[PDB]
Structures are given as C-alpha cells and as structure tokens.
Amino acid sequence: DVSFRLSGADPRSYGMFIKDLRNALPFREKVYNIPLLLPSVSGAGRYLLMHLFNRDGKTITVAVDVTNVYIMGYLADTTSYFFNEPAAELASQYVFRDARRKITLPYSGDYERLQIAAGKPREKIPIGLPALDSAISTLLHYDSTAAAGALLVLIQTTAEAARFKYIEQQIQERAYRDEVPSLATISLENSWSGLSKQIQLAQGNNGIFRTPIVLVDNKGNRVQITNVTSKVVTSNIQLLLNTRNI
Numbered sequence: 461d462v463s464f465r466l467s468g469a470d471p472r473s474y475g476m477f478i479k480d481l482r483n484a485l486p487f488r489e490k491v492y493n494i495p496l497l498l499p500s501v502s503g504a505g506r507y508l509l510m511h512l513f514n515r516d517g518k519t520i521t522v523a524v525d526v527t528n529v530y531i532m533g534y535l536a537d538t539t540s541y542f543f544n545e546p547a548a549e550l551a552s553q554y555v556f557r558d559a560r561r562k563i564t565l566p567y568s569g570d571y572e573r574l575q576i577a578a579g580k581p582r583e584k585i586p587i588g589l590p591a592l593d594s595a596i597s598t599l600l601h602y603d604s605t606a607a608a609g610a611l612l613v614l615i616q617t618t619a620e621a622a623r624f625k626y627i628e629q630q631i632q633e634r635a636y637r638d639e640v641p642s643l644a645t646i647s648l649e650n651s652w653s654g655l656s657k658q659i660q661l662a663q664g665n666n667g668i669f670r671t672p673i674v675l676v677d678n679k680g681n682r683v684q685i686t687n688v689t690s691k692v693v694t695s696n697i698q699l700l701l702n703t704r705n706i
C-alpha cells in the first residue's frame with residue numbers, strides 16, 4: 461500500500477510518495493523505457509490501496525486499479541463509496557469488504573460527469589497539496605456535490621501526477637498555494653490514452669507515430685507529437701496504458 465501524510469509534506473515527500481505510487485503498479489515490459497502497464501490483473505491484486513492523511517491526521521483509503529491507474533472509490537472509516545460504473549462495482553467485490561455500509565455515488569468516475577456534478581470544469585478548480593488536504597476532509601463526510609469537486613482534485617494530484625512527471629511538478633509548485641491547472645496539464649490528462657497507443661504502435665515503425673498526437677501543452681497552443689524522441693516521450697510520460705485497454 462502507498463501512504464501520504466499532508467502534515468509536514470514538502471515537495472520532496474510528495475515526489476517520493478508519487479514515486480512509490482508509480483512503483484507499486486506492475487508491468488512486465490518497458491516500451492521505449494517507459495513501464496507498460498499489465499493488460500489485466502485478477503483478484504484483489506488488481507487493486508492498489510492508497511492511505512491519505514490530511515493535516516489533522518484524518519485518513520481515507522483510496523482504491524486504484526493498477527492496470528490503468530483508475531480511482532474506483534474509497535473508504536471513510538466505516539462507509540465505502542464507489543463510482544456508479546461497472547468496473548467500480550466489480551472492485552467493490554474485492555476491496556473494503558469490512559465497511560459497515562456501501563454507498564454508490566450518483567455518478568461515474570470520469571471527468572465529464574464529475575465536472576457536470578460539481579458545476580465547475582477542471583480548469584477552474586485549484587489544485588495543490590492544500591486542495592488535496594481539503595479534498596480528503598470533504599470526503600470524510602458524505603456530500604455528493606462536494607465529493608465531485610474533491611474527487612476531481614484527488615484524481616489529478618495522485619493518478620495524473622503518477623502518469624506524467626510534468627503534472628507531478630506542477631503540484632510541487634503548489635505545495636503551499638493552490639492554483640488552477642494549466643492548459644498544458646488539461647491536455648496531458650486527456651491525451652494519455654492517445655499517447656500510450658502511439659508510443660506502442662511505434663515499435664516496428666522506427667519510433668514514428670502512425671498518427672501525431674497534438675497537445676496544446678507548452679507551445680502555448682497546438683503542439684504536435686510525431687515520434688518518440690519528443691520530450692513528452694523522453695522525459696514526461698511515466699506510465700503507459702496497455703493497448704488491450706484502449
């Protein structure tokens with residue numbers, strides 16, 4: 461299990477938690493030196509448990525599917541909450557079996573539903589380590605609108621920071637003050653699947669992408685990734701999604 465404690469978290473310890481998280485996921489191969497996430501796992505072993513403590517030391521356990529880094533739901537002392545989606549219902553079979561109550565959130569765990577539910581698009585929700593602490597605290601007592609907002613912060617500061625070193629760096633910049641995510645990071649978040657596929661499709665095409673992944677990222681708008689020498693490949697993306705899951 462990976463843990464993090466916001467109390468006395470500087471940028472180093474976050475980075476260290478994020479390295480752990482990355483490290484708890486299994487992969488067999490590395491494609492172009494990036495870990496290729498297994499195409500599937502079976503059992504409770506498909507699920508990684510994150511223990512997250514806020515500043516007062518209250519904790520939620522979050523459950524992450526290790527095949528795609530997808531947050532399934534979590535446990536707040538005796539209650540578990542899962543998303544309203546099939547994978548999340550399957551997960552419920554293997555995790556938090558000892559909770560005294562199981563609530564299904566009114567929404568699935570994808571961004572479009574979570575933003576709708578929360579009233580703000582991702583671009584207008586501050587993220588940082590102070591936000592995450594807030595987010596943890598919200599989650600500790602049920603409010604389905606407040607949770608949509610915290611879950612949006614929660615996904616971005618754990619799962620998306622695992623996937624991309626850039627985003628893990630943004631959050632380090634925000635260890636003591638929150639700030640809305642950059643276009644660059646909304647773009648990276650959305651393109652993980654596209655990127656993942658093309659990096660794999662480039663083995664046996666000479667590191668060349670069959671289709672070029674255009675990021676807004678940091679060319680202000682409209683960058684285009686076309687082969688694997690690009691920095692988003694060489695230095696940014698940290699975890700690959702298996703093409704069996706795309």
Ligand SMILES: Nc1ncnc2c([C@@H]3O[C@H](CO)[C@@H](O)[C@H]3O)n[nH]c12
Pocket residue numbers: 528529530531532569570571615619649650651652653
């Ligand atoms: N509940 C969740 N937990 C982790 N990641 C996601 C995502 C991510 O949004 C992007 C797909 O368009 C991709 O990174 C998918 O992994 N949406 N919801 C998520």
